[PDB]
Each structure stands twice: as C-alpha cells, then as structure tokens.
Homo-oligomer: A and B are copies of this chain.
Amino acid sequence: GAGTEVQDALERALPELQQALSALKQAGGARAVGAGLAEVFQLVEEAWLLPAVGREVAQGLCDAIRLDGGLDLLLRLLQAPELETRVQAARLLEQILVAENRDRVARIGLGVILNLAKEREPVELARSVAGILEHMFKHSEETCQRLVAAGGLDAVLYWCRRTDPALLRHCALALGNCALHGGQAVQRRMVEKRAAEWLFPLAFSKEDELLRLHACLAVAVLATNKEVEREVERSGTLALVEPLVASLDPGRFARCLVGRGPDDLQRLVPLLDSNRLEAQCIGAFYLCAEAAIKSLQGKTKVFSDIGAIQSLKRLVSYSTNGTKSALAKRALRLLGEEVPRPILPSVPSWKEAEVQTWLQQIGFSKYCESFREQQVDGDLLLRLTEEELQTDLGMKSGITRKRFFRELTELKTFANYSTC
C-alpha cells in the first residue's frame, strides 16, 4: 500500500522535525528562532506540496508538532515582541491547523491570537493571522461566539479595505466559514456589523475569480437567514450572484481543487432547499464541482446519503432559471442521474400521463399503478384529499400522506392557473 510510502517520507521528515524543535529551543534574538521556523515551514510545505499522497504526510507532521512541542511553543513565540518571530510563527500555524490543532489552540490560547488581531499593519503578518482565524472559525459555535465578543470579527472586516490577494481571499473565506459555522445569533452579529456591506468590495473584484466566488457563497448562506434576509437584500449584494455563476464554470475550478467531506458538503444542501435564487445557484455550482471531483475519485455515494439528489430533482422540476437548471443538470449527469423533464405548469390540464410522470418525479412511482387505476388527472389530482388517499389509494401511512401533500402544495405553489 501507499501507507508504507507515507511512513517512508515520515521517517525522513520526523528527524528534520527534531532538528527544528532543537533549533527552536535556543531563545535566539531573531536569527536561530526564525531560521528554525522558516525551515520547518518548508518541511511541511513540500509535505502539502507533495505531488504523491502527501496530505496525510502533512497531517502526521502537524500531529508530531502537537505531540512534540505542541502549539504552546508557537503561542509563546507569538507573544515575543519581535515582529519577524511573530510573522514566521504565524506562517507555521497557518499550515498546521488540523481539527485537533484547532481544538488545542482554541482551548489553550485563542485569546493570544485575539491579542494579535488588534495589530494589523504588516500585510505578511495580517495574511497569516487571517488564515489562522479562518481555520479557527471552522471549529465550534462557542469558539465563533468568543471570536465575536472579541474583535475576531472586527479584524476580518477592517481587512476588507486593503489589497493583498491572499489576505482578501482569507477574509472572504473566513467570514464564509463563520456564517456557515457561527450560529443564529452569530449571523445576527455579522449583519449588525455591516457584514454584507463589506463582502461587497470583494465579490465585485476585477482581480480574482475564486475570491468573488467564495465571497458570494458567503452572502448566499447568509440568505438562509430570514431574520437578516431583509438586510442582506438591502445591502445590494445578492445581485452579483447569478451573473457571476453564469460567467464561470463548475469544472474549470473543480480542477482548481484537484474537495469537501461528508459534513462540509451537507452544510450546503440547505442552500438548495431555500426560497431564494442566490442560494440555489451557488449551491448547484459548488455541488457540480464536487460532483465532478467525487466522480473522478468515484466517491459518488455521499451525495445520496446527504440527499441533495432529491433537491437536484427539484431545482429542475419546478425550476425556471436557465443557469440554475443548467448547473443542476450538469451535476445530475456528472453523478449520472436521471434528469427529469421540466414538468407542465398547466397543472389543471394534466392528463393521466403527466400525472404518472410526476408521480415518478417525486419518488412516488410506487403509486403510479394505483393512480392510473383511479384515472388521476390535472383536476382529480389538485382536489385529492386525506380520506381519498389513505382509503382508496391505499397510501396507508399518513406520514406518507403528510409528505405527499407537502410536495403537492409546492407543486400548486408552482402551478399555473391561466385556464381556471
């Protein structure tokens, strides 16, 4: 297996990590410390930059740094009043924040980081600080809330008036991870601090493409917050979403990844079941990119259990948006799934045929027989009832009935009536 090869690369790097750890123990003014930092940075850099299976190599490296020297070492280096020390150490952090690294650095010394945020002048420093927070806003709602009480939100917002590419990429990605990982009152805090009004200069850039894309994923998941929905819209930012999604391509940046796990994907399907245009389009976009990637790897099963496939059968069935429908179909075919036809809006005039078609298009094809028996058509459908279903159509589970009526409503919600 390749695991032996990863162990091989480790048997090389771990000694280098010991050399570094040694080099860090001597409290050099700015020379030996910085040297050790810079080198161990490259050691884990080529680990991430390992063209072979090198992800888990870097994971083992950060594991060793946590089990040998921990983070508290680096934490104290962050309180060393010398800039360069802080900067380099922060760079190191920026590459070592694994989930467990996040847990530790949170529990022990996130407040130190919070002290680093108050100072923002060195663009190289600020870049690192931003990325660190970005990874940290992925940890826990409590962690976020703490970052919110602290100027852990003020800093990323102050940093939206500068021009560093990686910095702004960090800030956008950060606030996006925040909103998706903050919590109800947290999104509140976001908008109440003019969050969208500072996601604006970034999604609007003529400079970077992933910058705007993520910067719009942010406002998009925000749109899942009805409570601030009205303020988000008033910011004048959700306009930029659909044009941009139209502009770019799923695959062209799916290959800029090679993406997510079974939980960073699932935190997005709620973007597809929303009521708003922006959430649907960005959701279909990211889902199409990850569908291409997971089909390349062949891991096309996760989507089913998280179940976006059903939604992808709805952002077309009752769709009306071209870009939305196109991206949805593209993800459906990259997942190799039955693209349904756009159903007929003149639901009054549905004959038994489209009744059967529709019955399938909701995964209730299991009843198509019963309905073709009872001649359910565009009228007898819309006036279906409880006793009718449960008794004559044998749908014995109200839990079924409760669901069928749900979809039936959404259908009517789409249904046209110019005939009746």
Which A residues are within 8 Å of any B CB, using their own CB?
A: 1-2, 106-107, 140-143, 183-184, 187, 224-227, 251, 254-255, 269-270, 273-274, 292, 296-299, 305-307, 320-323, 326, 345-346, 349, 351-353, 374-376, 379-380, 383, 388, 392-393, 396-400, 402-403, 406, 416-420
Contacts and interface: CB of A to CB of B under 8 A. Distances in A.
Given A1-B251, A142-B320, A353-B307, A400 B375 contact: yes
A226 to B, nearest CB: 7
Given A184-B416, A418-B184, A419-B270, A379 B352 contact: no
B392 A388 contact: no
Nearest to A319: B142
22 contacts: A1-B254, A1-B255, A1-B292, A2-B296, A140-B322, A141-B320, A142-B322, A183-B416, A187-B418, A227-B418, A269-B349, A269-B351, A297-B297, A298-B298, A305-B351, A306-B351, A306-B353, A375-B400, A375-B403, A380-B402, A380-B403, A392-B398
Contact of A106 (B187, B322, B416): B322
Nearest to A186: B418
A409 to B, nearest CB: 12
Contacts of A106: 322
A375 to B, nearest CB: 6
Contacts of A399: 374-376, 380, 388, 392-393
Contact of A322 (B107, B298, B346, B351): B107
Contacts of A418: 184, 187, 224-227
Nearest to A184: B418
Contacts of A187: 418
Given A320-B142, A352-B307, A379-B406, A397 B374 contact: yes
Nearest to A251: B1
